[PDB]
Swiss-Prot record, chain B:
It comes from Saccharomyces cerevisiae (strain ATCC 204508 / S288c) (Baker's yeast). Present with 91800 molecules/cell in log phase SD medium. This is Fatty acid synthase subunit beta. Belongs to the fungal fatty acid synthetase subunit beta family. Fatty acid synthetase catalyzes the formation of long-chain fatty acids from acetyl-CoA, malonyl-CoA and NADPH. The beta subunit contains domains for: [acyl-carrier-protein] acetyltransferase and malonyltransferase, S-acyl fatty acid synthase thioesterase, enoyl-[acyl-carrier-protein] reductase, and 3-hydroxypalmitoyl-[acyl-carrier-protein] dehydratase.
Length: 140, 80
């Protein structure tokens, strides 16, 4: 959603908020029910939340900010709540991946900034599953 | 086997409980789920803290062998 500013936030956004936040919450909120009914507590599911640095810093993306900003609150809970043994949060970042605004990427990269092909940002999030990090997620 | 008695004798389930609970916590693996439906294969997951604690517990057993008096310390679990 684009072109949606504060007086345009309506149905399409209130819908998108559910695709991104309250159902990613009820995905995790509902693999635990299955983790916990079997009794599985040694095989936790690493979550990979796609986050971003865009928190209302860009223009009118709609309610795309407080959607992906209200996902780092998923650390105030892995320590607070009871689902720590079955889910392990591993936040990530939508950096600047080209594909899905594509004509100014070459512009920014002149500021000493890297932008990623999708196959490149593929590599990064995919290295977020490396057997090394998997433990690292599994302490904190 | 006994899972009928286990439903009846308070003094009996106090045994299968004190057993699986112990196995549940020391090898991540309960008999009461074994006997009531024998599975074909059993994978043991080594999750977070409880998981690592259980996996080292798996690797902590040693199969010795008599070789000319040598109490030869060798590993129970080679794939671990």
């Amino acid at each position: 959603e684009q072109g949606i500013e504060l007086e345009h936030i309506d149905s399409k956004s209130e819908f998108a908020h559910r695709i991104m936040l309250t159902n990613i919450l009820r995905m995790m909120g509902c693999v635990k029910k299955q983790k916990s009914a079997r009794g599985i507590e040694t095989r936790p599911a690493q979550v990979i939340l796609p986050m971003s640095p865009n928190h209302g810093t860009f223009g009118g993306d709609g309610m795309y900010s407080e959607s992906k900003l209200s996902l780092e609150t998923l650390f105030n809970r892995w320590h607070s709540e009871s689902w720590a043994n079955q889910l392990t949060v591993c936040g990530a970042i939508i950096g600047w991946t080209r594909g899905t605004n594509n004509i100014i990427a070459e512009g920014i990269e002149k500021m000493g900034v890297r932008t990623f092909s999708q196959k490149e940002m593929a590599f990064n999030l995919l290295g977020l599953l490396t057997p090394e990090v998997v433990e690292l997620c599994q302490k904190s | 086997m006994g899972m009928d008695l286990y439903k009846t004798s308070k003094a009996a389930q106090d045994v299968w409980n004190r057993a699986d609970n112990h196995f549940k916590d020391t090898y991540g693996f309960s008999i009461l789920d074994i006997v009531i439906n024998n599975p074909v294969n059993l994978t043991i997951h080594f999750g977070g803290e409880k998981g690592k604690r259980i996996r080292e517990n798996y690797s902590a057993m040693i199969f010795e062998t008599i070789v000319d008096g040598k109490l030869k310390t060798e590993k129970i679990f080679k794939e671990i």
